[PDB]
Design a protein around this ligand. Structure first.
Ligand SMILES: Oc1cccc(-c2c(Cl)cccc2Cl)c1O
Ligand SMILES: Oc1cccc(-c2c(Cl)cccc2Cl)c1O
Ligand SMILES: Oc1cccc(-c2c(Cl)cccc2Cl)c1O
Ligand SMILES: Oc1cccc(-c2c(Cl)cccc2Cl)c1O
Ligand SMILES: Oc1cccc(-c2c(Cl)cccc2Cl)c1O
Ligand SMILES: Oc1cccc(-c2c(Cl)cccc2Cl)c1O
Ligand SMILES: Oc1cccc(-c2c(Cl)cccc2Cl)c1O
Ligand SMILES: Oc1cccc(-c2c(Cl)cccc2Cl)c1O
Ligand SMILES: Oc1cccc(-c2c(Cl)cccc2Cl)c1O
Ligand SMILES: Oc1cccc(-c2c(Cl)cccc2Cl)c1O
Ligand SMILES: Oc1cccc(-c2c(Cl)cccc2Cl)c1O
Ligand SMILES: Oc1cccc(-c2c(Cl)cccc2Cl)c1O
Ligand SMILES: [Fe+2]
Ligand SMILES: [Fe+2]
Ligand SMILES: [Fe+2]
Ligand SMILES: [Fe+2]
Ligand SMILES: [Fe+2]
Ligand SMILES: [Fe+2]
Ligand SMILES: [Fe+2]
Ligand SMILES: [Fe+2]
Ligand SMILES: [Fe+2]
Ligand SMILES: [Fe+2]
Ligand SMILES: [Fe+2]
Ligand SMILES: [Fe+2]
Lengths: 287, 287, 287, 287, 287, 287
């Protein structure tokens, strides 16, 4: 089974702008440039986010991590049983991603996805943030989460749940006007409240935002100010109703947003599905 | 010696507005009306804040608490030795304040002050906040703090330090324009980083603001939204450089502000005086 | 200085009734009979309560403990300096009490008092309660407390405070009718909120009650039922406003009451004197 | 299933040198001499390491522990199902090893292996180290680990994983020259990050080294100096990238090395396989 | 002021017997032989017990530790003010003891005493017990205690209390026959319940026993058996009424006894003097 | 009284080399350049180490921190009473150092010293290390320590102890050849085992080394490798006998060494002076 979101790749029009934003604003660590593009770290892994030159200015691909080779084989079988076109990543791609093995495919709406095992650790190159950040929260919870924008949430939900094995945490019926209410589904694959959210929003991108979690409230507070200095804040500090994460949102150079948060609650086998009519307990005022 | 700030009285033009603000917005508990005015609670004490009808729309008086009768006598002696006009509170005033004994006087610039002992507890009338607040932080740290605006900080500092016994925590040189920088002094009389601050600000009131501390970040977050709904926020959420309190500021019906915060650090006998050039680590953006 | 209340002696008309009450109802341990009367234990000390045959049916004497011989000498000097008639306990009395040294005198209203040092421990005779009690709370807090009924509280307060060194914790103005309100003073000599209380009640005894503290709520609950079975309960379970002790009151065979409680808060050097208008937060309904 | 590495036997040319090295340098306890050779302890077990006279100067055999007789029977069946020649240890061998029951066989490359249950405890002969060592870490993690040098890692990996049940922790691609890179596989059978490692190194011995873990950093520091005094250090202090153990390496009298470490992290069912390009975060400089 | 008992020296007729007893039976560490005699350790200090050849077969001297040079000077002054003959230890003696400075004198009954500061630490020679002992308890509590046998306890008590500054913990009236009861005084100079005890016992030695405290119950249990094997036990395992130490007693080769214990309670400034009629809660049966 | 070592200034011939060494090797944060020279941080303080252009290639000055203005006045008085030439730092110097007030003078051998109060905090510019360091340990323990090389240790000791108020922790008699042994004195002014050490070493500099303490063992391990890469290590990893700090030593561009450590023990009022014959328990091999 999939254990977590392991990495993400972005294809952007302004690579230099993304380099500055990720390091100076968010505090990620520059980790070199390879055939995989500019690499960025948040922990012991060789890379978590890759930035390549591209006109889409959007998420180019996402990689989900399994525990081992057997886990990869099981997922490949499940995908093919579901009629999904699966391709074994050649040695060249595995090297580019720095993984031992991987398979590639796309979700129902074209997002390139990868499932891999045996990623590269670089403890000998101790993580040093590009900005003052006490630390990022990863471990068994993986990289964080992102919100997949789709045309049909039911079809997307069925794929991620029935085929990829994600489990529902909760639903938030997002009010988008007196005559518009869209359900947002939050799914987990580990203790992180959600690793993936699905919603039918009127956005021209594959995702609304990706989220990175930090170790302290000050990490969030300082980052907010660094981002605000450039007028990139899209939402004030607030706490979510479902995962109870305290965060703010900001614009990346590609328009896609990034959520930066702290203190979210986790889920387990005793968790029960619930619904909400608001996404924020307090704060998160649109600006 | 003075152990803490015990209570405050305000003389306001719109008593009903203050009643609604303190209870519905800040979460204080209405505790009846007596010859002491409308009373409000935040803990086991019979009252901490009193609101009376008055045209000044400002702090009318403040009461500092001593441990016992002997403590009151010592302070009265110290004040008279300093040439300050001290008056023993008559039985009528003691009853009004609900204290066992007290003395009255004024600081160098006219603020009526009182030092008392033996205030009234009402554990049999369990505290119930007027809004969703997990709790206020008082105990040995007292009510909170307020910032006394004065024409001459040196004279004020000498009185509060040499006569009343407050001790300096730190100084912040507040930038108020390319050609204006004013020092703000933060003083303690217990573990609370500061119970009183002194500064020469261009304000027509006795104090810039008073501060109340709550038990959780959510208490602050929810209150921010309740206040923001009425457009009364004066500063966004932020954390101070000196006491490390996370708070926001808002306007009371009298114009004087109120600071609502959480998680401040405390001080002790190992504390050393320092200086700062900024009052906020992050946040506290003027709005 | 006096460190705690160490023991109490009662002169009663029905010794057998007291023996049964203390052991079967309250859970004290029978510890033999000597020239000191019937002895009862609650901890490692050879005895804490003595019961002798007497028509007064009241507290016959109370012993306060000092840390050592030097402490005893200091107290004897303080008492004589105050004009109090002090008598050195002869070897015979010291043996009877099982102490190394002691002095005797009376308070302003005739209560025989003793100050001693070097009491006897009997760890080799492990404490075994006479009823199901997980344990009594003593240690540095001593035996517990009792309430001295006096004709003039001011005179009594001055003696116990100025001469014996007790310190005021708080005051409760006890309502005893639309036209009657009497102040009750609670005094400490260690961490126990109060070891002695003073009040001018209309009672024909030296004390209103003595109090013993137990280790768990169940100890109190079970004892309540054992006492209630004989119709001796005088007050339902409740919690006090000042020491926050959860307790109930009952009648001893002498009429004097006994308070049996659990979970009281303690005091220290940061404590400030306060006042109350009620003695109970909840419960303690007279029955 | 195999629960841990339980013991090891070495056949050496200089038994006296090994006796001195194990006790004076590493701190093991001499535990007598039997038909099993010279015995050495590190905990409550009668012996963990045996040293016999032999010209190979290498690991002579290794014993893996199962929980009980049923566990032994299951492993014997699994081995025979795999076509491995298994022999039931006769009463004579069981006595020599001090175990209740055992089976013997060899791995694909000739290393004599044993699986047993019911080893002997000697709590009545309290462990006393031969040198200043606060303690060795064993318990459910067993003796420690050793690195099996093989000609074909794939064949070895398949045997230890598919037949013996070891699970992969991670892989480190060891750089051994611009044109030489060999993968080292680390396998676990309990919480210890690895109980066995497999690699195709150019060494004329069955193992590169065996490892013993101690309770404190000082245990390692002092041992380093005792070994360094004789010029036997082969690697400076360092911390591994995979198990995060802080250790140093040294030469035994047989040339085979020994690793002595502290503070390694453990693994569980939430562990995911990863890869590394370096075996040390810091230190471990070859000397 | 004296901070603890730092070391002891014994003059014995059978040095080899003492060497074996201290190391093999009690677990002390042999620490070389100098002009100070055979040295033995129990912790980081270069030595705590010295054994020299002598016909007295008794304690030859004891050294009390002060915090620094100023402390030594103060004690020397106090002793001379009391009329005691004090001698400054020459450089030769200081070297022999491995201390920076010391003064020598005798107690009222001839026991040679020394007060010193700046003893030698040997952390570079890590403590290794001569037998299986998890550790000895020293630190701020010093070496342990010993019981000084005297002809006149009152005179001895006055010297150790009034001159050396020891403080009384408690008294035990030791029953030694229907017509014989002797008081034993236990004195502290730090947190250890007692560092010195004084009693008028009918023994031909300077001390009844010296005591060493270990870290676990097993340390005591195993030692008991090692001593019992040679028939040297003088008292079964038991727990004391005053310090609550669990221990046993045994005969040294000189006849003087040694107490070996674990888990004693400590004392502080809140401690009150008490008396006992038995020295043991349970156990300590004479054999 | 002096509370800690607050800052140090170095006058060096190669400012760029020092900039690279402090940031890239040790992990300090570049904090701008002012009339005070190049500034470097390790915590919330505006600066802790300053580097100015100078031919001495040595410590140029050191600043000791007092708690407040009163503390500064007391020290100035003590110094003048001792006949030391004290100069009040003018507003220009105070600004350069970023302190509220300070006095200047020199120790007996020419080292310029300063005592100040009210240094500048910059929490709004969150500390970001120049290399991977989890954190530096400062707080109430100050910057760290340095070893003052002097011609006459007795004279130096008397000044720092009798005049500046430092207290002795311990002494280590450093072996420097069969015929050379020099005592090194370690002094504290707070909980840090030593803030200053004094010794008569044959070095042409004012100090042998200065020391910085980090939060984890890995911080030390990684730094060791960064320094070793340039062949600047002067001592292998080891742990000291007196403060039990685990550290290594390296050469700065000025020749003066720097010690980088972790996990030292602290001292308090229960500490007793001792002596040592070795400075290291293990490690610290000269290379
Ligand atoms: O906040 C956002 C999150 C995801 C996509 C867009 C976006 C929109 Cl709504 C229109 C044009 C281009 C972009 Cl990147 C966006 O503004
Ligand atoms: O992490 C989250 C938890 C709950 C809701 C949102 C959310 C919001 Cl607040 C706005 C748009 C889209 C989403 Cl998924 C979210 O990002
Ligand atoms: O934020 C504030 C704090 C204290 C006083 C005033 C004030 C001013 Cl600045 C002008 C007129 C009236 C008032 Cl209440 C104010 O606006
Ligand atoms: O509690 C506080 C700590 C530090 C600074 C201020 C402050 C600010 Cl942020 C603006 C105006 C006046 C003050 Cl005292 C403050 O209120
Ligand atoms: O509850 C009580 C506490 C103390 C004394 C009496 C008492 C009274 Cl109020 C009258 C006669 C006899 C007694 Cl013991 C009593 O009833
Ligand atoms: O322990 C106590 C704390 C507060 C009040 C009383 C009290 C009551 Cl509840 C009734 C009569 C007398 C007293 Cl002292 C009391 O016994
Ligand atoms: O460090 C080592 C680990 C295992 C084996 C050898 C070895 C070699 Cl590489 C050659 C000859 C003999 C030996 Cl023991 C060795 O030196
Ligand atoms: O315990 C370990 C963890 C990671 C790597 C090695 C290793 C090294 Cl550092 C050199 C040679 C062989 C091995 Cl297995 C190792 O012994
Ligand atoms: O247990 C003992 C403690 C101290 C001294 C002696 C002793 C006696 Cl009681 C007589 C002769 C010799 C000795 Cl050592 C002893 O037997
Ligand atoms: O440590 C101790 C605590 C209480 C009593 C004794 C004692 C005994 Cl049990 C017998 C003889 C002498 C002594 Cl001091 C003792 O050694
Ligand atoms: O390790 C050292 C610490 C302090 C000073 C020097 C030094 C020496 Cl010993 C000679 C010339 C120049 C220097 Cl910096 C040095 O080498
Ligand atoms: O922090 C320390 C503790 C004990 C000793 C030294 C030291 C050493 Cl190891 C060599 C030269 C000088 C000193 Cl002060 C030291 O720097
Ligand atoms: Fe999100
Ligand atoms: Fe789930
Ligand atoms: Fe404030
Ligand atoms: Fe203070
Ligand atoms: Fe009571
Ligand atoms: Fe008190
Ligand atoms: Fe290894
Ligand atoms: Fe596993
Ligand atoms: Fe003893
Ligand atoms: Fe004491
Ligand atoms: Fe140092
Ligand atoms: Fe000190």
């Amino acid at each position: 089974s999939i254990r977590s979101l392991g990495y993400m790749g972005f294809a952007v029009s302004d690579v230099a702008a993304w380099r500055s934003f990720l390091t100076q604003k968010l505090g990620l660590m520059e980790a070199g440039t390879t055939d995989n593009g500019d690499l960025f770290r948040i922990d012991s892994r060789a890379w978590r986010i890759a930035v390549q030159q591209g006109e889409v200015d959007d998420l180019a691909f996402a990689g989900y991590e399994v525990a081992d080779a057997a886990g990869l084989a099981q997922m490949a079988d499940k995908l093919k049983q579901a009629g999904i076109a699966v391709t074994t990543g050649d040695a060249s791609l595995a090297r580019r991603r720095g993984v031992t093995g991987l398979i590639t495919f796309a979700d129902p709406f074209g997002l390139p996805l990868e499932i891999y095992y045996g990623a590269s650790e670089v403890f000998e190159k101790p993580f040093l943030p590009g900005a003052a950040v006490s630390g990022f929260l990863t471990g068994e919870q993986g990289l964080g989460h992102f919100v997949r924008c789709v045309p049909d949430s039911d079809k997307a939900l069925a794929f991620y749940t029935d085929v990829l094995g994600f489990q529902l945490s909760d639903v938030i019926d997002m009010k988008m006007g007196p005559d518009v209410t869209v359900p947002a589904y939050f799914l987990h694959c580990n203790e992180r409240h959600h690793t993936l959210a699905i919603a039918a929003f009127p956005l021209p991108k594959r995702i609304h935002h990706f989220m990175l979690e930090v170790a302290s409230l000050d990490d969030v507070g300082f980052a907010f100010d660094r981002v605000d200095a450039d007028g990139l804040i899209t939402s004030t500090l607030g706490r979510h109703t479902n995962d109870h994460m305290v965060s703010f949102y900001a614009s990346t150079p590609s328009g896609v947003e990034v959520e930066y948060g702290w203190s979210a609650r986790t889920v387990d086998r005793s968790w029960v599905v619930v619904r909400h009519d608001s996404p924020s307990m307090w704060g998160h005022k649109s600006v």
